[PDB]
Design an enzyme around this catalytic site. Structure first.
Site, short mmCIF file in Angstrom:
data_model
loop_
_atom_site.label_atom_id
_atom_site.label_comp_id
_atom_site.label_asym_id
_atom_site.label_seq_id
_atom_site.Cartn_x
_atom_site.Cartn_y
_atom_site.Cartn_z
N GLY A 229 0.68 -1.18 -0.04
CA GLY A 229 0.04 0.05 0.01
C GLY A 229 0.69 1.35 0.19
N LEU B 170 -21.37 1.27 12.67
CA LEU B 170 -21.99 2.02 13.17
C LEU B 170 -21.58 1.90 14.81
CD1 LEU B 170 -25.23 2.00 11.57
CD2 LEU B 170 -23.37 3.53 11.09
N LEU B 171 -21.41 3.07 15.44
CA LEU B 171 -21.22 3.26 16.77
C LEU B 171 -22.20 2.38 17.85
CD1 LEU B 171 -19.38 3.84 19.23
CD2 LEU B 171 -20.30 6.19 19.43
N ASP C 211 6.76 -4.15 9.05
CA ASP C 211 5.35 -4.52 9.41
C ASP C 211 5.31 -6.00 10.10
OD1 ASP C 211 2.62 -5.16 7.86
OD2 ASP C 211 3.30 -3.84 6.70
N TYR D 253 -12.10 4.95 13.97
CA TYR D 253 -10.80 5.30 12.92
C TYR D 253 -11.05 7.00 12.93
CZ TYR D 253 -8.53 5.68 8.49
OH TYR D 253 -7.53 5.94 7.35
#
Ligand SMILES: NC(=O)c1ccc[n+]([C@@H]2O[C@H](COP(=O)([O-])OP(=O)(O)OC[C@H]3O[C@@H](n4cnc5c(N)ncnc54)[C@H](O)[C@@H]3O)[C@@H](O)[C@H]2O)c1
Ligand SMILES: NC(=O)c1ccc[n+]([C@@H]2O[C@H](COP(=O)([O-])OP(=O)(O)OC[C@H]3O[C@@H](n4cnc5c(N)ncnc54)[C@H](O)[C@@H]3O)[C@@H](O)[C@H]2O)c1
Ligand SMILES: [Cl-]
Ligand SMILES: [Cl-]
Ligand SMILES: [Cl-]
Ligand SMILES: [Cl-]
Lengths: 411, 411
Positions: free
Chosen positions: A195, A274-275, A215, A331
């Site tokens: 990435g 969703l929280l 990593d 996040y």
């Protein structure tokens, strides 16, 4: 149609055309002096005749102190816009608004951001706009500004558009070679097996750095390939591990003379939910990797002297940390925290000769709702990080810059 | 489907449900004490049983100092989200990040904005999210926070979503009647003959203010109708005129006891044109009305003492001033300048007991790319201005707040 953007390659001139520098402030003349050898400088003229298209146009607005003086933006730029080349660079340089010296001057220097962001939405064929603020306490030579102008005035900044760069008062020393600016520097890149991290390693090595690619164990095979390709070393470790700082310290002591010049906190995960529907493991894992680990690596490696004078710390934030994103309360908290790390540590690390900054990528091909009408590439993110990492970027700290093609989304 | 939003009307309770206040910081208890009489406060409970839906949920995050402590956001909010009513209010209160007292604490308080902006994009049926920062130097009673919480925790804030409110250290005095907060105040509103200005006049008069409505000679007929409707006075004048400050001073001396408590710089024009195609008159007219005139009225009326202790200045900025807009290099410069006026004058005017703030409307019906999936109304803008104008908002200065339904567009 979306423009195919020019990107950096060794030996290609910085701009696709001439460079015109104007305005009646304190930076126009020292900037012309500093850039004359590597750029094709041309003077303004009342006839509006220039043999070549402009690859770059810089307006020094540091002398504007009254709203009546903002008309100089209009009179300077209106005759010049039709001569811009594809992928040209338009830059306005102002004075840090709170330092501009009077109420009226602070008002006009703050107003410059409305001008630049609007102009960016009018430029065509891949051209970008940038606003650079310079401390009122910078010396006349403005040497601390040079690495910022050289990043912007190049193909390296292809996907950085509409942004504000904030340069402090300190003088700078150029690298021995602006085309190998990281020569001799040891750079640690976390999350480097794939990435954006893998491309950061490549760009750093292109610029002359010795890369420690980090990593997890599960990525050891890909990690070794990245390390071998860039001429660096591979260090398998989980950045959340208690002994992560010890292991990095031992690794650079064994292979790289005991020091780290550049730390890029790039490793990250998502656990979208969703929280109302999220469980504890999805919250905790994201905070541990994306926020606690960068804080611990940064404070631990500064704290044991591995990162010392001239050090550079760059964190990977995200547009989600700035604008928020549905399903990413975990996040986005960590990515706003990465900005917080840069903003909180900047004064503390300045005492040690260390800068810390953050990059906030938008849409990176890993699309169309931006001024460039296309998604960014990993190299575009890596170039902005390498700009912060430059030894000549010592006067740049506490900045968050988005790499988004001037995306519509934001706060 | 877009939610029909509840908006303010006298006698309607502030929230459409109960108010739960939690968190283990320095503001939860004094806020419960301050709001208990006018709100229906309920306590949290481990059983997750509440007779009514939540009209408001406030989390006091001022005690969180470590990234491990951010988990309190998760544990507090996850059991509560399903009990939110339509058009509920979710608020997180933190400490001004640069004042939070340690590197780790500044990091977590800064991170709260990633959390709130993301949560706002998950709430449904017209509910909104807000982040409020309170100076570390506020007294235990947190009285300077009250007008901000009462604005947010009401239908008045219907189209304000995802925003950050910044409250300083000063104590506040409540108005005699929170439902007539501007009682006895003289408010000057420029551009009041139509549009947002006419609605500002109405909302100010609803709240008890005596309004001086200002607009140009050509709008005299409509201006008188607005003035008569709100019980105020009409003053025809061009805000760019040399004698504008004199004329306002004479008018309030003749009719309103010689003082101005509230000045709203709302008059504005556009002259849209790509910069490459713009002529001088389109640049100059826009700077004169939208930037020079607000600066001159503000400095002139403060400078001759007409605006004194307790004064309130509010400028109309715009999302174009924050994000830029194609064809509006002139307009967006002036709207970023309006932010600059608030930011530059805030410390200067604080010595005089005067605050200055800016409002940045997004899409106002004068559409769908926001969390509320609908365009705003002029009253929604006027309510935010009236919040700044409150005599109890003395600890709120230098703020720019967007009224945009949490629009996707921004910087
Ligand atoms: N569009 C994008 O991809 C995007 C946009 C904005 C920000 N970002 C950020 O940029 C960074 C790179 O993103 P990416 O898309 O390349 O991610 P990725 O998932 O493809 O790669 C991240 C790498 O980090 C490694 N990693 C994860 N947890 C680790 C740990 N505990 N210890 C060590 N290594 C670990 C992974 O193994 C992986 O190789 C991340 O911080 C991400 O949040 C990405
Ligand atoms: N969607 C929106 O309407 C929107 C969005 C963001 C910001 N704004 C800003 O909000 C304010 C109100 O906008 P609006 O849409 O209601 O505008 P409008 O054009 O409908 O009304 C503005 C009023 O100001 C008056 N005015 C203009 N120049 C004047 C002068 N020199 N002296 C005195 N009065 C003058 C006009 O006569 C008019 O009555 C403006 O500052 C505008 O830039 C509006
Ligand atoms: Cl100067
Ligand atoms: Cl979900
Ligand atoms: Cl506390
Ligand atoms: Cl045009």
């Amino acid at each position: 149609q979306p423009e195919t953007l020019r990107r950096y390659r060794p030996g290609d001139p910085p701009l696709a055309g001439s460079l015109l520098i104007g305005g009646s402030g304190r930076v126009a003349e020292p900037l012309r002096t500093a850039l004359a050898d590597d750029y094709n400088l041309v003077s303004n003229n009342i006839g509006g005749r220039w043999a070549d298209s402009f690859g770059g146009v810089v307006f020094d607005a540091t002398g504007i102190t009254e709203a009546e003086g903002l008309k100089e933006l209009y009179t300077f730029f209106t005759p010049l816009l039709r001569n811009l080349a594809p992928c040209a660079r338009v830059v306005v340089v102002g004075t840090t608004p709170a330092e501009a010296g009077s109420v009226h001057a602070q008002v006009v220097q703050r107003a410059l951001e409305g001008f630049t962001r609007s102009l960016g939405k009018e430029l065509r064929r891949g051209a970008t706009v940038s606003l650079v603020y310079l401390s009122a306490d910078a010396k006349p030579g403005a040497t601390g500004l040079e690495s910022t102008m050289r990043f912007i005035l190049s193909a390296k900044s292809a996907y950085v558009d509409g942004q504000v760069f904030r340069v402090g008062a300190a003088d700078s020393t150029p690298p021995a070679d602006w085309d190998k600016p990281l020569d001799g520097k040891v750079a640690v890149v976390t999350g480097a097996a794939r990435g954006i991290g893998a491309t950061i390693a490549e760009v750093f090595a292109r610029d002359g750095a010795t890369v420690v690619a980090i990593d997890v164990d599960g990525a050891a095979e890909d990690l070794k390939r990245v390390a071998d390709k860039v001429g660096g070393t591979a260090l398998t470790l989980d950045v959340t591990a208690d002994d992560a700082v010890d292991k990095i310290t031992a690794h650079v002591t064994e292979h790289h003379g005991g020091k780290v010049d550049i730390l890029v906190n790039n490793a990250g995960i998502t656990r979208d939910k969703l929280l109302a529907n999220m469980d504890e493991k999805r919250w905790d894992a994201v905070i541990a990797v994306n926020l606690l680990a960068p804080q611990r690596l940064t404070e631990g490696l500064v704290g044991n002297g591995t990162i010392g004078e001239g050090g550079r710390v760059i964190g990977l934030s995200s547009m989600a940390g700035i604008a928020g994103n549905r399903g990413q309360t975990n996040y986005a908290t960590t990515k706003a925290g990465m900005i917080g790390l840069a903003e909180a540590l900047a004064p503390v690390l300045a005492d040690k000769g260390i800068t810390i900054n953050a990059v906030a990528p938008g849409f990176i091909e890993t699309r169309r709702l931006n001024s460039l009408f296309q998604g960014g590439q990993p190299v575009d993110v890596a170039e902005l990080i390498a700009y912060f990492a430059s030894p000549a970027s010592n006067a740049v700290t506490g900045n968050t810059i988005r790499v988004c093609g001037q995306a519509m989304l934001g706060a």
